[model samples]
Target chain A: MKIGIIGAMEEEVTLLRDKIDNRQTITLGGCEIYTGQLNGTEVALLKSGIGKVAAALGATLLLEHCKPDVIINTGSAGGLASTLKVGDIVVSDETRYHDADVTAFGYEYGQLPGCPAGFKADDKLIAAAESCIRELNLNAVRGLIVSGDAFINGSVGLAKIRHNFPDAVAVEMEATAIAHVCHNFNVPFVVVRAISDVADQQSHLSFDEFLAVAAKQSTLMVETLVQKLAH
Target chain B: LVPRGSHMKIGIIGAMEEEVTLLRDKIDNRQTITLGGCEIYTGQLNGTEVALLKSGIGKVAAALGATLLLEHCKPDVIINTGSAGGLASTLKVGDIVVSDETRYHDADVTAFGYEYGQLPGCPAGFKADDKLIAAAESCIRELNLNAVRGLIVSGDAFINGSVGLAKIRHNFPDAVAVEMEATAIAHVCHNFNVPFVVVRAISDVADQQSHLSFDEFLAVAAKQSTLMVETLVQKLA
Candidate 1:
């Protein structure tokens, strides 16, 4: 199966790039696109820039050019659920924009004007990631991943998102935008994030400590899951 | 480019056709180009070179239209005029909101430690150009229109019920109006380093009652918006 992998930062994808065989790199709009084979699966990988617009642009370019069977986004996120701890993985079964307010038009929270309130992950891919988690014995949970353009670091912010999305396990900057783009493109997609910090007042300090490690963890998990899917 | 003392090229966008029809009808020397699924009208309006486009509803479409306009026509300034629901208690139907700033109410990146409405790698909001805002403010005075220069929150949703109103109000207590397309347009314009202004007419209070009066009020409010836009364009030209 052909797979597309998107990461927002160099640290998140550089390690994986080292494992890609016959890798070729293309630069577009300051974004680096790396295409190669990983675990016998043809893969197109990109370090999509930060924020919603960047992710949407990257996904659009990736879909138009690479046309992979599935797109997998791997990154680090702040733990929103109490059960999550540093290094824990979250396989987003769904995603919603916590910041979207179209209620004046009678839409639900996080609902886009002409789109659903949330974007569901591909079930087949979710199952594959679930099984891979078992094989790796990773501390992982499958649940909603809330996305927006901000980095939530304060209790007030955390409480706000939690109040809106109580079931969310993690929060990040790009997942829902990518999900939105994938939904429009009719592509199967999933987001796998490693918890780098609890989304609290100290989130920034903690994020610095765990970012590299958590990104590597999620990257490894994505590698294993894609390997299984390739079969 | 036209020589000195020639008409200044201005781009005008609205989310829907009704919001733009009156101004679109006033254009002279009209030429048309279709791009990004939007029909762009380039012409002269009240002695100003004006490009009018009805950007489809919502943030994404607005962003696309703004990008296309910036790339192709490269107008000296962009004005986004539309109908919005009143958010601040002081705002009432027919009142004008000359936006001092436009923010994305739906962009939640707080978990990563960004402030509310603050997108990572971008400013919390896009500020309307001071000179343009001043010009609009002056026009409102000349026309004897009730207007306020304040924050405008934009999202993809329509925000109609009590729940929606309370939610937006809580996040943006100072926001005078809420609408779609403005924030996205402002964001794109900011990236292009283009001067832009968002002027919206209040059509409803963003409550359940909005449903009752929306269609009727949209027509009336749109007229008011057109008047303000017309006055601003003449002054600028």
Candidate 2:
């Protein structure tokens, strides 16, 4: 099975580059595609850039050119679920961005087409991660997450979001766009995130440190998922 | 330079087209200029230079017009005249409702860590130089136009339902009339230190019956209230 991994920023993807073996590099469609073997499974890595427009464009390019069986959107997000602490991992159950009106475009918020609303992380993927954690004894939790463009801060902004989406597990910027792109192409995909920092502006401005840890976490997990796909 | 009277200029802006037209015509010596199907008429009312322009519907257009007209025309005072659906009982059709406060629906004042009566960049509300409202009221007293001075709920949508009204009243209890354009204009006016007044004639009861034909009655009341605005403009100079 062929698998592709995409990252938005250099801080997240640089180390993932070394995990691949027999690496081959090629440029296609204004984006570079790098191929290598990860855990004896063929994996391709590309820098998708940040923001909704860039994420969607990269997802389109990945589908049109790479044609991977499943694309894993791996990144870091601000933790929303009260139980989630710094460095905890959240697998996307369902992703939606509040800033963008999906409903206006005929898509329901908090649910993808043919998916249930408020669905927690993809069970199969979570089960895979859980069992892996049991086998490897890794730490993780599963729950709902929100994706949005603006950095979450300010009383009004926070209150507005908190009022509408009380159960939001985490808030990130890219996953919803990735979901939209993959959904548009009927491509199977999963989103995996590590909480870089808790969602409070005054406390824990641990972005760089948390990002480094998250990169290591997702890079290894993507590798493990790729091996499992090969089996 | 900008003619003799702009320093004391009084500008009138509103969504009520006919009411503005009557005020535009009544102001002693005013010239109405048209731009992009939008009009900016300048005249001498009372003893001041007054520029009257229609801030076409919605927050964006109103804000844009408010900033430009206030800055270039340098109007010392702005009066947002129009018909608003009555949000309070004391305000009725043909009644002149003066806004003591203005609320912008999406203004998100509380969340931004700003005071209730003043947003970060703009004053949350203006006192409307009470003496002016009183003078306008006294001038119209003989006309027997029903008049109430209270808060105005500025929204981006037409106030046509009880649910919308309940929500607004929940946030702003004293709102007498609800309309789309004034809140933003009022905010702009507040920021510029331009003494501002939002005078809305109650065009509808803001009830279930409002949805039936409020738009039609709004036109009639708007036309009927022109005399009150013309009188205000006449006294402005």
Candidate 3:
């Protein structure tokens, strides 16, 4: 099976790039698209830059060019759920925006008019991720993922988001935008994140220390899932 | 300096058909092109080369529309015209609001020590071009409309009642209006260094009966926005 992987920063995906064979790079929209094989599965990988705009642009380009069977966004997120700690994994089953408000038009918070109420990760992909976590013996959970353009680190900000999306286990920057685009294109997708911080007073400090290490955990999880799905 | 050669192009976007239809109907020598799933109507309006598109509703859709307009039509300035719910008590149905600045109340990057509405690598709010704001004010005065220049907040949620209004007010106390697309368009415009102006006509006060109030005023309010924008385009031309 062919898979598309996107990371927002170079470090987030550089490890995976090292493992690829027959890698070819195509540049578009100022982003370098890497095409190669990961454990015999055709893979297209790119760093999506950052924010909703960049992520949407990257996801659209990937869909048009890579045409992969599935698009996987693997990156680092700030933990929102109190139980989550640095290094925990969140496999998103549900994804939505926390920033969009159009209630005056008779729509719910976070609901994009004329689109699904929310974007749900592909069921098969969720199942595979669950099995992969077990196989890797990683500490992980699957739940809602909330996204905005900001890096959430304060308790007040994190509480506000949690209040809106009580079930969200992790929050990040690009997943929802990618999920939104993939939903529009009718592409099955999933977001895998490793917690680099607790999204609290110490988030920046914690994120700095754990980002490189935490990203490795999520990337490894994605690699294992790709291997299993390829079979 | 404004791009005021004889043939400068201005791009205008609205979130719905009502917001752009009246203006679109007034364009001359119109040609339509579909880009990024948006039907852009390019023509001359008030002797100005103008391109108009309905961006649908929501921030993502607005960003797509704005980005496509920048990449394809390449207008000198982007004017986001639409209907909004009045946020401050000073506003009433059909009153026009010309934004001095626009911000995304929905975006919270506070954890990163950025203020609400401030994205990383961007200002807390996008200020409207002084020239365009001045033009809008002049037009509003010419039309003798009840209008004010203030802050506008935009988001993906359709704000309906007092609850939603309170949430927005908690962040943007000075905001005069709330809409769905202006902030996203403003952000995109800022990224391209293109001056942007937002003119919105109040459709409701954003309360429990806002939907009813909005439905009652939408048609007339849309006309108010269209009228103001048309005059602004004429002055610029």
Candidate 4:
């Protein structure tokens, strides 16, 4: 099986990309797609820039150009559920926009105009990810991983996100957008991210310190999961 | 070789059905293509080759529509014609606001020392092309419309309360207009290295009073923005 992986920043993908054997690269606009074998599995990796538009553009490019069997978003996210701590992993059961609100036109609080309120992660991929978490012996949870353009750093922002989406366990900048594109194209996809910090007043400060660990944890998890799907 | 001014092609975008219907109907020899839930119309408008896109209402749709336009239509310049809420106190309903600069009022990554409203690898402000701005101004003048050129901030949520307006002003004190798609369109154009401008008419004042008036005035205000876009295509082409 060919697995597609996307990360928003270089740090999120550098370690995993280095593991790709015979990797070839292509740059399209602000996104980079790298294709090769990862532990005997075919893989296409993308480093989408940041924000909703950037992620959506990258997703479209990957879907059109690479056409992986399933796409997996691997990166770092802010812990939204109180159970999460730094270095904890969160696999998405579903994703939504924590910021988008078009209710004036009768849409849901976080719904895109014509799109669903939340995009579901593929059931099989979610199960595979949970198993990968077990094999890697990492702390993990699976729930809503919401996304938006802003970084959640304080209580005020946390309150707003929580008020709108109380079930969200992690928050980031790109997952829902990639989910949106995958949904539009009728492709199955999932997001698996490591928690860098609990999204509170000190979340940003902890993010600076735990970013490396978060990247490492999620990368190892996704790398292991890809090999599982290969068989 | 440098191209002549009259030989340039244009792309015009609007976010809503009402916003694009007037201009879409005006496209001579029009052809339509729909992709990923957005519509793109390519044809002649006032003797100018133009592509008009009805980008759905949001930043993601705007950016995706922009990429589709660039890849498929290949226009020399892109103009966003739509409606916005009046932010600055000097503005009133039905006034025209041309974008000098656009930004995401909702984006805040300041925790990492990035500027508020600045995304990674993206600028805090996306400046409209000077020539495009001038062309739009000339069109406004020719149409004898009241217009201002300044910062136009955008966010996903509609502003209808003091808390919302206060939040926006806390970030951009001097912003004159607010909308949903202009900044994202600017963001995409910046990445693609295309000249672009926003010409929008104010349909409301961003309050409870404005909310009721928004729907009532959208069609009427869209006419002003539609006219601005039609005139710009005529002049630029």
Candidate 5:
């Protein structure tokens, strides 16, 4: 199975980049697109930059250049749910922009003027990842994932999101925008992220220290997912 | 040194022709200009230099209209007047609601670890000038109008039904009114360093099932707001 993967920041994508064998790289619009094999699965991985616009741009370019079977957003997110730990895996079953509001004309909250309110992950892909989670023995939960442009920190920020989206477990910057882009193009996508912090000021403080763990765990999840998709 | 506040200019925005006509009719010395799909009328309100605009519905429209007025008219303070849906039980149709502050009911940047309703490089909510807010209250009371001073939220949707109302109350429990353009106008005013206050009256309440005539009661609300605006201009020092 051919796979498309997006990792927004350097730390989030470093392990994945190093793991791909004989990867051929080409730069497109500030993102580096690498064509390679991850555990023998054909991979078109993008080091898409941060924020909503960059991720949307990278997705379009990635689609224009190499339209893989499915796009997998691999990254680190702040954990929103209490049960989530510093390095636990959280996959996007539901994804939306936690910051959007064009609601006056009856568009959903977290929705743009004409876009869909929320993007649901591909059922087959979610099933595929769940299988991998068991095989890899990773601590993971599937729930709503919200994205915005802020690097949300502190108790105040945490309460805002948690209150607005009660079921949300993963908070990040680009996942929902990528989902939005993919939805417009009719491409099925999934976000599989490991927690970088617990989404409080204290957790925000530990982010620089614990980022590698989130990145490391997420890499294993994506790697195993790619490997399992071969069957 | 600048002149005294007795000569200060004011900018006002009302959404739709229904919301603007009552106030618009009072301007015989009106000067009209059209820019960015907005029709701006410059004249005098109660002998004070005033610029009036009809900001077509939606955030982009409101922001653009507010900016055009701020740029072209150069208001000392901006006031947003229109009709709103009463979010609270006590604020029924024709009852006035003034902004203590404003926020977006649906602007949720919290996922990025930002505060609720906060955009990048913006505060969580837009603060109406305390001076302007107090002045508006004085005008409302002077007009003998029943007014509530509380949070007024803006979004692109006209909130109706139990679900829309429920979602709003769940997100901002204390909000007294919901509308389409107030917060964006407030945001634009804040960006331009102009004091602003939102004055609205409830047009729809009770989550009415029949195709709500957001039409019939608009004039009722519009007339109420026009008098308040008229009083405010004359009274502001």
Candidate 6:
């Protein structure tokens, strides 16, 4: 089955293209789509820009045009829990954006109106990833993955994350948006993250530094998983 | 003391303008139509500031209207006084019931790995406000009238008391009654930290011999509950 995988950061893209065979940089709609073969599965990989809107658009294009049997979104996410560490793999069972504060508009907080209290990720993929993690003896967890468009600075966003997802293992910028798109298309997908930094009051690490190493390790895992999925 | 006043700002929200008008006429001079989402009527019914408005009828309407009443209008206590079918055996035509809890049963809790029950939806604290519930309960008891206080389940769909019971048991483990719109109202109130209750009259029992089968019987029984609201308002006031 054909698979589509997308993420941001061209450095990560460059590394993934090298590992896969018959990779041709195909540009469509004035955008480059990474064409390749990995783990015996024909793959179309592309760099989706950061944030929800970008992720949503990328997923939409993939769903409408490619109509792949499955889509996997892999990335580096911020650590919201103490258990998460640099390079540790995190598999999300659910994605909840704590920033869904409806009070800012008119109604109270818990009164989500039309939407459910939380938006979740695919459980079927979650189960498969759990088995893979156990077999590999890798450090992995299945828990809430919170998302936000807010800056990663400690002061403003941390308090907001704590309010709703106090028990979340990590926070990412793109998973929930991708999950929403996958849900709309009725496609099976999963997001795997490598925690490169912990988000707390006292922490210091440049964004460039973490993104480099985290992105590389994340691609390797995706490459390995893609192989297993094909068989 | 907060000096709890019995003068509750009673608000009746529905989808029909006629029902709101009928409720307004019964309260008479105590009613004043307020310009808002589809004409709301607020007045001094049974000495309580009674307000009746149409919430347009779907889940969104119920949610939006409840938010407006709780935040802007600022009723000390809110009640979704409306018409519903009898869900339990003891309930008959014209019987008044105070909702215990509202169950949004159809909501998919599976995504979150929620194990059992209907969504433990919005709990009705109207009973907790002992002073008001007591006033309504005794009015029914002393008059030898049929009235009950238990879980009044609320959802977007119409359900017989039996269907409501199964749904309520799934979500809210221990519930007594079920209805629509009221739970949404109660949920909004709960979020805003406002005291809320729901009073529903059995217009349809979902039974072969229910008073609701006859058009005249339905109207008469519904009016009975409306009268009960007036009494509750006066007693609380």
Model number with the top DockQ: 4
Q: Could you give the CAPRI-style class of model 1?
A: acceptable
What are the per-residue Cα lDDT tens digits for candidate 2 across B141-195? 8667778778777644555565656777777777778776777676556545677
Model 3, stretches more than 4 Å misplaced?
Answer: A1-4, A9-54, A57-70, A80-85, A99-106, A123-135, A149-166, A198-205, A223-231, B1-6, B28-39, B46-48, B160-170
> Candidate 6 — which residues are off by over 4 angstroms?
A28-31, A104-114, A201-206, B1-237
Q: Residues B1-237, candidate 4, lDDT per residue (tens digit)?
A: 116654677888888888999998988999999876789998899888888999888887787778778878888888898889998888777789999999999888888888999998998899999998998899888889898899999888777757777889888998999998999888878877889899999999887566787979998789888888888887776
- The number of the candidate with the highest TM-score is 4
lDDT-wise, the better of 2 and 4 is: 4
- Residue A212, model 6: lDDT of 73
Q: All predictions: root-mean-square deviation over Cα?
A: 5.1, 14.6, 3.9, 1.9, 11.3, 17.6
TM-score to native of every candidate shown: 0.73, 0.50, 0.82, 0.95, 0.54, 0.47
**Pairs with steric clashes in candidate 2:** A81-A169, A93-A120, A93-A121, A156-B111, B30-B43, B47-B237, B48-B237, B117-B124, B118-B124
lDDT of 4 at B46: 82
A58-152, model 6: which lDDT tens digit per residue?
55556555677887778787787777677788887777655433332243332233444555666766776777777777777678887654335
Q: Number of clashes in model 6?
A: 15
Which sections of candidate 5 miss by over 4 Å? A1-231, B1-6, B206-213
lDDT of 5 by residue, A123-217 (tens): 99999999988888888889999986667776666677887799998899788868866775678899999998876766656687899999999
- TM-score-wise, the better of 4 and 6 is 4
The Cα error of candidate 4 at residue B197, in Å, is 0.6
Worst 10 residues of 6 chain A by lDDT: A104-113
Question: What would the DockQ be for model 5?
Answer: 0.07
Candidate 5 — what's its lDDT?
0.78
Docking quality category of candidate 3 according to DockQ thresholds: acceptable
Interface RMSD of each: 3.9, 14.1, 3.0, 1.5, 9.1, 16.8
lDDT of each: 0.83, 0.64, 0.83, 0.87, 0.78, 0.60
